[PDB]
């Protein structure tokens, strides 16, 4: 009974691999060889946001690229004014073991979650001026790892129970559920068109999900370890993945295979966070060796190293306009990096 | 402009004051992680020590001993795989490990679980408080003798009771009960350095001194960590 199904699955996998190999007209390195290298890139800490007690496990930038929300393991959700370093809010969390945070595009809502399996949404825009829990979502058995906002009414959530769910603010119910993974889903990123999103789990694979339809589009393989962080390239037509094998891979929605592998022999620490710049040329990825390396998305070269952190970096985010990058770490400090002409 | 900046500065000052006020509260409490298999009586020791009080996924238990706040966290409705969320507990004072010593089948699984925790890169500076629960069950099993240890641990035949052992009781039960203790000690010291140490304790289903042992071990961990900062030890 199961033998025929296994044989059919193996044949389908072989056909998919053959189709992917046939489509490999060339590689990114050959076409990018005749391009100007990015060269050395210098990053200097402009602002140092201090005040968190425990390690930071997640941060997110606002639409205005001025207010950022940081989540730490002491149960505090602090919103920072990056321009003036002032703390505009300090939201105490019911559970200290938080793992993710999200800022709504409108800026009136902020979400967080962790081992409690509870996605707590806070209404920042209130008349009394005191932040309160808008509602709580309880539908995921596994630990909550990531959460992102589609709009003021819809939120996409990634859990560690190999499932992804989409919720609504009005009723707090799962409109759709994505069940196609075999490992813990760590992080997910929403494409700019907001039509579809991609995610990566603890199975060395990534799946592209359709929000409205609710079914997986394509799957991606090639990584040797669990996928830790995922980001969408600006054009929304590609995404990058990071794993514990000290290697970052780039995937394309049309080629359905890896584009270019970013790795170094010296680097042996896994990835914790990854994000792209405004133009997408600069790829910033977290690492467990207490620093962040800027990777050229085309030439696959280390443009620079962000070695201003004592402990390993867990989160990093780039502003909407690309003005500055904020890299959180386990040293309870947030660093804002920028260049100079 | 000036008024808005002054208001923002005042709000930041208030937030910083709240953070400073809540720093002492955060530092006072000692975070603990409770781990163990299904056969281990984690719930028994959770309910027995709950008398010291001051879907879900993770449970929180708060108990006070000697006017010291102690918060321990027990993982509930979570998946079997634990290589990812275990990194969140790197800052805990100690990790409480409950082992069923009266099974002889899951004991190897407990040994493998100890190997993963001890050799974890992030769980390298955390001392492990070993709780050998169900020692009453180990004692009765030894006397009747249907199930032995040699068939599961061949080296038990050549094992000898250590001189430093202090039996509280026929020689058979203490020889086997200390043999399991020797197995756990040798695994902890096989590759672990002086950064962290394993504290083994003998636990039953009716003992009420488990909270005292945790407080004593946590105090020792804090004292050793202070000495490590001073580079004296």
């Amino acid at each position, epitope marked *: 009974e199961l033998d025929q199904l296994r044989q059919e699955a193996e044949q389908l996998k072989n056909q998919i691999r053959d189709a992917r190999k046939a489509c490999a007209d060339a590689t990114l390195s050959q076409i990018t060889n005749n391009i100007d290298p990015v060269g050395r890139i210098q990053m200097r800490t402009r602002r140092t946001l201090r005040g968190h007690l425990a390690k930071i496990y997640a941060m997110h930038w606002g639409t205005d690229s001025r207010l950022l929300v940081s989540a730490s393991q002491d149960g505090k959700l602090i919103i920072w004014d990056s321009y003036t370093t002032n703390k505009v809010h300090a939201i105490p969390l019911r559970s200290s073991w938080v793992m993710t945070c999200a800022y709504a595009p409108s800026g009136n809502y902020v979400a967080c979650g962790g081992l409690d399996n509870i996605c707590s949404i806070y209404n920042l825009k209130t008349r009394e001026g005191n932040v309160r829990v808008s509602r709580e979502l309880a539908g995921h058995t596994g630990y909550l790892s990531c959460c992102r906002f589609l709009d003021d009414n819809q939120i996409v959530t990634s859990s560690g129970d190999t499932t992804c769910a989409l919720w609504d603010i009005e009723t707090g119910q799962q409109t759709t559920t994505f069940t196609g993974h075999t490992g813990d889903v760590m992080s997910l990123s929403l494409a700019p068109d907001t039509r579809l999103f991609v995610s990566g789990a603890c199975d060395a*694979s990534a799946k592209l999900w359709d929000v409205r339809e609710g079914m997986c589009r394509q799957t991606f393989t090639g990584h040797e370890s669990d996928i830790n962080a995922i980001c969408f390239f600006p054009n929304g037509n590609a995404f990058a993945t990071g794993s514990d094998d000290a290697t970052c891979r780039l995937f394309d929605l049309r080629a359905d295979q890896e584009l270019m592998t970013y790795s170094h022999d010296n680097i042996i620490c896994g990835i914790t966070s990854v994000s792209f710049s405004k133009s997408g040329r600069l790829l910033l990825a977290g690492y467990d060796d207490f620093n962040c390396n800027v990777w050229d998305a085309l030439k696959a070269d280390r443009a620079g190293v962000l070695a201003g952190h004592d402990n390993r970096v867990s989160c990093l985010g780039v502003t909407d306009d690309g003005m500055a990058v904020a890299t959180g770490s386990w040293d309870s400090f947030l660093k804002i990096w920028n260049g100079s002409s | 402009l000036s008024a808005e900046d002054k208001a923002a500065v005042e709000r930041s000052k208030m937030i910083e004051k709240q953070l400073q006020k809540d720093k002492q509260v955060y530092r006072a409490t000692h975070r603990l992680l409770l781990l163990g298999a299904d056969n281990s009586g984690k719930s028994t020791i959770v309910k027995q020590m709950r008398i010291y009080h001051v879907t879900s996924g993770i449970f929180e238990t708060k108990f006070q001993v000697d006017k010291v706040n102690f918060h321990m966290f027990d993982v509930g409705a979570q998946r079997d*795989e634990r290589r990812k969320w275990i990194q969140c507990f790197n800052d805990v004072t100690a990790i409480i490990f409950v082992v069923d010593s009266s099974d002889y089948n899951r004991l190897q699984e407990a040994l493998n679980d100890f190997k993963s925790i001890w050799n974890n*890169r992030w769980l390298r500076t955390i001392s492990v408080i070993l709780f050998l629960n169900k020692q009453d069950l180990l004692a009765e099993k030894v006397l009747a003798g249907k199930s032995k240890i040699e068939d*599961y*641990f061949p080296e038990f035949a050549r094992y000898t009771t250590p001189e430093d052992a202090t039996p509280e009781e026929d020689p058979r039960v203490t020889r086997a009960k200390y043999f399991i203790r020797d197995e756990f000690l040798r695994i902890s010291t096989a*590759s672990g350095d002086g950064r962290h140490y394993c504290y083994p304790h003998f636990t039953c289903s009716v003992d009420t001194e488990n909270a005292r042992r945790i407080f004593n071990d946590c105090r020792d961990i804090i004292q050793r960590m202070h000495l490590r900062q001073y580079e004296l030890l």
Partner: nanobody
Framework: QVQLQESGGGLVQPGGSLRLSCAAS????????MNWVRQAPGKGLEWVSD????????SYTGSVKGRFTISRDNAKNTLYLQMNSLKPEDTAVYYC?????????????????????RGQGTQVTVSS
């Protein structure tokens, strides 16, 4: 795609000897520690033995200590497990498992019900 294909097993008289091999692809064999686990019928998965990246550190469980020999071939990217003098309680499904992360000596979810880095396994049966 990371996959493991166990080869070997079959019907062997008790007290006999058989050799089974683990094929690996899609990852660096040398950089990843490899383990051997067992799942007896009516029982959960249990650990048997593991081999280090270079083979310097080798360990076995007490139940099979001094009975099985594990060999690791980095050049041939395959894991070997030689067994002799079997027992009637040794019949089970032998699963070839890989540690989740490289360059680390800790492997947490190797003996997991729904582990991802493990093969389909080969049934071994011993009986008179």
């Amino acid at each position: 795609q990371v996959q493991l294909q166990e080869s070997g097993g079959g019907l062997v008289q008790p007290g006999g000897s058989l050799r089974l091999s683990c094929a690996a692809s899609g990852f660096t064999f040398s950089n990843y520690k490899m383990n051997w686990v067992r799942q007896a019928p009516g029982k959960g998965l249990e650990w048997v033995s593991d081999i280090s990246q270079s083979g310097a550190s080798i360990s076995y469980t007490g139940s099979v200590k001094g009975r099985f020999t594990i060999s690791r071939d980095n050049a041939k990217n395959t894991l070997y497990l030689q067994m002799n003098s079997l027992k009637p309680e040794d019949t089970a499904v032998y699963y070839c498992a890989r540690c989740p992360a490289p360059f680390t000596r800790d492997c947490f979810d190797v003996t997991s019900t729904t582990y991802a880095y493990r093969g389909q396994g080969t049934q071994v049966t011993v009986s008179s």
